[PDB]
């Protein structure tokens, strides 16, 4: 079935939904094994994590909406998530393709959004050295802490993309 060309915004919308679908498949696999995403003591794994999240000051919610500050926050947030998506690559075999897809699709999305931004002056790029050490730190942990880290990343990334999707529909 044929259609007209997607606009930039429609392309972005479709990209986010594709990533969410992939995150969903990853979540399903994680929660069907090991601790079954039992989350009572997840605060323990959260200590080592600085996961991006929306706040009202970011201007991504309908109330207090601000297109410029929101877009900056989404791009900055997604750039910060990338080290955590790299972490996820080793945690899924029997789902290699899916974890790979989520990671690649997020990179494509970042580029779409950076095109939409111009300028990128307010965009804080995460430090590679800090990211390499963080990744090492996360991988060194025992299996239980790694299962919890995995679940926290998936949930938090899902939440960030859901809020991003809603905000980008207003742009």
């Amino acid at each position, epitope marked *: 079935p044929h259609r007209q060309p997607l606009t930039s915004s429609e392309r972005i919308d479709k990209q986010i939904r594709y990533i969410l679908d992939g995150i969903s498949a990853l979540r399903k696999e994680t929660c069907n094994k090991s601790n079954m995403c039992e989350s009572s003591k997840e605060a323990l794994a959260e200590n080592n994590l600085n996961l991006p999240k929306m706040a009202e000051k970011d201007g991504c919610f309908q109330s207090g909406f601000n297109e410029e500050t929101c877009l900056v926050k989404i791009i900055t947030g997604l750039l910060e998530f990338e080290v955590y998506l790299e972490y996820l690559q080793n945690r899924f*075999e029997s789902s290699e393709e899916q974890a790979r897809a989520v990671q690649m699709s997020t990179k494509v999305l970042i580029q779409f959004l950076q095109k939409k931004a111009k300028n990128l002056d307010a965009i804080t790029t995460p430090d590679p050295t800090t990211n390499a050490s963080l990744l090492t730190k996360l991988q060194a942990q025992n299996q239980w802490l790694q299962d919890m880290t995995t679940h926290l990343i998936l949930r938090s990334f899902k939440e960030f993309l859901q809020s991003s999707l809603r905000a980008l529909r207003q742009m």
Partner: antibody
Amino acid sequence: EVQLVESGGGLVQPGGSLRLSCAASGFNFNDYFMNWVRQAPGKGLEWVAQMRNKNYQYGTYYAESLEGRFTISRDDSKNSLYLQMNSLKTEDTAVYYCARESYYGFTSYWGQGTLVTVSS
Amino acid sequence: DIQMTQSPSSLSASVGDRVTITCQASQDIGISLSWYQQKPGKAPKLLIYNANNLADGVPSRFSGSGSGTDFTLTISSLQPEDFATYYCLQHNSAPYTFGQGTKLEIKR
């Protein structure tokens, strides 16, 4: 019952190499992380190395004090753990225990240990 | 690597007395610390796992406490079979680390 049995211990000259073995039985060896722990005569416990499973890409970790002289490996078809030791020094003289690592990280099962003596 | 400071190195106590052994981790390890008892000529025995959970068959006079960096093993009313060497294990992140050990001996 879970059983871990070490082999390959004994005397070795300073600078030498020795390969320890551990035969595991009574559980699905493949699923578990494994550790080596050592204890010099009359001294404290010293954690040595970790061997991870297939799910974790057979990752390996070592105590830093070992300075890369040791290599851990496993053979899942034989239910066996190995510790290849190189450039041995007299301070490596110890009982070496094979051990099963918990999901949670703590050591849950231990072998009886095998003595390695480094000496001329 | 995470360093462990176990205290004291040696302890002399009477049967029926109460003792505490402390371990400090060089960084936050959550509750991922366990306590081991070792008798001469034997492999170590797990007493307390994940800071405060008693291992199967371990008498309730043994109790573990703490979270973060500071941890305590308490033994109430020492019995003769409890005199041994005790070790904490940091099992948060590899390489794992044992404390230096506490040798607990009977006062007579």
